[PDB]
Every structure is written in structure tokens, then in C-alpha cells.
Write a protein that binds this ligand. Structure first.
Ligand SMILES: *CC(=O)[C@H](CC(=O)O)NC(=O)CS
Ligand SMILES: *CC(=O)[C@H](CC(=O)O)NC(=O)CS
Lengths: 88, 173, 88, 173
């Protein structure tokens, strides 16, 4: 027997800036969005699902400087919370 | 300690893991047995380009992400300096990987120059565009084209400009 | 004095289906996504932030029938949790 | 009781409201005083079209959403059967509304026929397109074009097809 399934489901995309806008990168420090994501993943993967972690990353960018960007979550079809359960 | 497989990633304790599974209902993605699961991740990073400026500092990004995804339990494929066509080919190959069948999730990381239309391939110029559209990444990894990851979290991360604007406006206080 | 602010921030869009795909509507019952959203808002606005509520709506569509759709959250720049605090 | 202003929307109690404000930190959007705030919401619903089929059942959607948004404390503007140009004009007018300055958030609801490129206006046909792009909605309501809603939640809801596909694939069990 055959069953129907959604063609697109359980996706989450996380972009480094909002549409039309630049994303910044330091020659020795790397890309700010990437470094910030690693930091937040390292700290919050134990207690927060990815959607929560991504929001916190956005929040960390809230105060703009000379090199400003606002990371953006896109095309989200997660139907459940995605916990990484680090250590498990 | 950071000498373990999870490195600098803070660990979820068993009491923490049972509490998350208790407080919220059956609306969490299931995790496969650590012993048997084969988690896969792909990083595509374009650093050296034909026409556009060199992405100095990409090495720090590759290292950081690679280690992070390994810390989270993923076997990491790293592919560098590819055209939009090569990226598509690489994505198609990733979708066909047998390990996904015995995996519970995946991560996809793209790091390159970018425009409003998408991510820049190695051969990109304004005269002759070389662009991978975000739309194509989803299509290649969806249920039709990647049945093995049906019902499984697919996390896409993109480091790239999405245009030329600074993304700011002024206001007085 | 003048200060910098992100041009695009604190947005969340919620679409009735995934890109390329149809969204369904009944002639007397209305649009399924709209009715489902009202139901979920009514039930969960008291206890859940909008991102959480939207996820639950997606989950409610998880099992596909003859008229299937997967609602999609798009271009999210919420930096905080948005609680409606109904009654307040 | 549903006889109150919040109708069928379940109420958040003061103990519940204090607990949400306590458990999670200062990462919740602030709510303005109920006494002084002027919350605004806009519904644009296209039901009757020049060329494309009639959206029978739109009335149920308008009623449901209008009442819901009123229940949540929003004053609701309802505009029906508009071209993409009219929708843009209406959006621009909404962005200029003084009440936003003394509001803490907004809701935007679009209900119409739709294609991959966006939402259909009243005069839409395949020969002569009449489309409002989702991109334009964000632009008209962002910080540059709507400074009054800076730092405030802007929730966009769209009921529309995003293409012609059924959105399904088969698998065997
Ligand atoms: C605009 C871009 O594509 C890049 C993004 C990157 O991470 O390389 N940004 C810049 O070149 C400005 S530092
Ligand atoms: C494809 C469409 O635009 C509509 C969406 C709507 O809510 O009217 N769907 C249909 O016409 C199929 S019921």
C-alpha cells in the first residue's frame, strides 16, 4: 500500500542577514554570524531547541554598530521542537 | 572537560534530558540510538573565486562549524570552491547517502559571497552569473528528492550577503 | 543626536502552504489554515508565544489527506518571544 | 464566558502572566497599558475577481479573523476586493496611522488567490498579471517606511496558493 506525505516538511533555514542586506566577515576573526552561532549552539543546545537558539542569535545582533546585520530564519516547516540533546 | 567528543558544547544531563521529554508533550523530534545512528552534515565553503574578492577568514568559519557539528554528533563533509553546478551535484550526492536512512537529522552549511538571488559559485561575475538559489537547496533535500530524511529535521545555515544595503536606518533619541 | 536601527526587524510571516503548493478553502467552512489558526490562537495565546503557536498549527497539518497543505513560517526577525497576554 | 471582549480566546490569568514574565528573562516583547494603547490590525480579503474564480467561503474567514483580532485587543480595518496597486496604497496608509505610535504590535492578514510570485489582486489574469509581492509588504512595514512600529512585533498572515502543486509525494508502508 502507498501513503501520502508532505513534499516539504521539517526544514529550517537560518540566513546571516535580512533580504537586500550585507553580512559581515572579519579577515582574522571570521564571519560574525558563524562565530555567534557556534557560541550560542555551544551554550544553549543543552537546554533550548534550535528555533529558540536561533532567536537568541537574532537577539544578540539587536544593537547595531558600524557593521550591522540581522540574521533571518526562513521557510520553516518544523512541526516539532528540535533538541540536539548534546551528550546523547 | 573539552577533551571529550562534544568539545566546548555544554552537555545535556540525563535529568535535563528527561525533563525536556516530560515538560513538553510528544512534540519533540525523536533522537536515534547513539550506538547505531549515522548522522551526516555538509559544509560547502567558497573562499577562492575567479573574479570576486577573496573571502579571507573563511578558514576560521570552516574550522569552527566543522568542530561544532562533530561535537553535536555529525560526520562532516567539507567541500570547497565550487561552481553552482558543482554545488548542485554535491547536494544531489549528499541526498543519496545511505547514512541518512539511519540518521535522525541533518545540517547543511553554505558559506560564500551572495546576492539577492542567492549564493555565489566560484566562477561568479556580474557579466556571467554563477548562482545557487536557496529554492534549489530545499528542493534537493525535500521528501521527493531525499526520501531518507522524511520526517527528519533539516537545518540549513547560510553565511552570505543578500544584497548591497547596510541594513540600517537612522532615528533620533 | 542620531542612532542606527535595523531596517528590518521584529517581523514574522505565516503562509498557508509551502512554496509551489496549493492552499485549500471550503465553500461553507472557509479556509482550513485560517480556521485552524483561529482555533490554535484561541486555545494557546494564553500560554504560548506566536512562534510556538504557529509550530502547533504546522503540527496539526502533519497527517495529509486528499487536500493536503503545510503552513510555512517565513522571514522571521523576532528577537524576543511575542506573547499576546489575552485578558491583558 | 464568551460574552466578554475576548470572546472564545482563552484568557491568560495574572498568575500565568507573572509566571511567563518570571520563568523566561527580559526576552519577551513589552505590552503597553491596556488603558491607553491603540492596537491596530488590517485584513485585506479579495473574494470577487474580474477573471479568476470566486472565493466562496471568504466571509467565514473575514468574520473569524476579524473577531479573533478584536478578541486579542486590535482595532480591525477590513478592506475587500483590491488591485495590487490598491493594496499597496492601503498598506502605505496603514503604515502612516498615528495609533501605531501608541501601539505595541500589529497584525496584517491577506486572503486571496495566489501564485508562486505572490498574492493576486482583483484584476489578475495570466495575460495581465496583478500581483502584490510578499517582499513589498515587509518593505512598506519596515523601520524606514513605518518608523512607528520600530521594535514592535509585526505579524503577517497569508491565505493563498503558492503555486499549482498538491504538495504531496507517495511512499510505501
Ligand atoms: C557580501 C558578501 O557576500 C560577503 C559575505 C561573506 O561572508 O563573505 N560580505 C562581505 O564581503 C563584506 S565583509
Ligand atoms: C490557489 C488559491 O489561491 C486558493 C487559495 C484560497 O484560499 O482561495 N485555493 C484554491 O482555489 C483551491 S480551494
Amino acid at each position: 500500500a502507498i501513503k501520502k506525505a508532505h513534499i516539504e516538511k521539517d526544514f529550517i533555514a537560518f540566513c546571516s542577514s535580512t533580504p537586500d542586506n550585507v553580512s559581515w566577515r572579519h579577515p582574522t576573526m571570521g564571519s560574525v554570524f558563524i562565530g555567534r552561532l557556534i557560541e550560542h549552539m555551544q551554550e544553549y543546545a543543552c537546554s533550548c531547541d534550535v528555533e529558540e537558539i536561533f532567536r537568541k542569535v537574532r537577539f544578540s545582533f539587536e544593537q547595531p554598530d558600524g557593521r550591522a546585520q540581522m540574521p533571518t530564519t526562513e521557510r520553516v516547516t518544523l512541526t516539532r521542537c528540535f533538541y540536539l540533546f548534546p551528550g546523547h | 572537560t573539552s577533551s571529550g567528543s562534544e568539545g566546548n558544547v555544554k552537555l545535556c544531563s540525563l535529568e535535563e534530558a528527561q525533563r525536556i521529554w516530560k515538560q513538553k508533550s510528544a512534540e519533540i523530534y525523536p533522537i536515534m540510538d547513539k550506538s547505531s545512528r549515522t548522522r551526516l552534515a555538509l559544509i560547502i565553503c567558497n573562499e577562492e573565486f575567479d573574479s570576486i574578492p577573496r573571502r579571507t577568514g573563511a578558514e576560521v568559519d570552516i574550522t569552527g562549524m566543522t568542530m561544532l557539528l562533530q561535537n553535536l554528533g555529525y560526520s562532516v563533509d567539507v567541500k570547497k570552491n565550487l561552481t553552482a553546478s558543482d554545488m548542485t551535484t554535491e547536494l544531489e550526492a549528499f541526498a543519496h547517502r545511505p547514512e541518512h536512512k539511519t540518521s535522525d537529522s541533518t545540517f547543511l552549511v553554505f558559506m560564500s559571497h551572495g546576492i539577492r538571488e542567492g549564493i555565489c559559485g566560484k566562477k561568479h561575475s556580474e557579466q556571467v552569473p554563477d548562482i545557487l538559489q536557496l529554492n534549489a537547496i530545499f528542493n534537493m533535500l525535500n521528501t521527493k528528492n531525499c526520501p531518507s530524511l522524511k520526517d527528519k529535521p533539516k537545518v540549513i545555515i547560510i553565511q552570505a550577503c543578500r544584497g548591497d544595503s547596510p541594513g540600517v536606518v537612522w532615528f533620533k533619541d
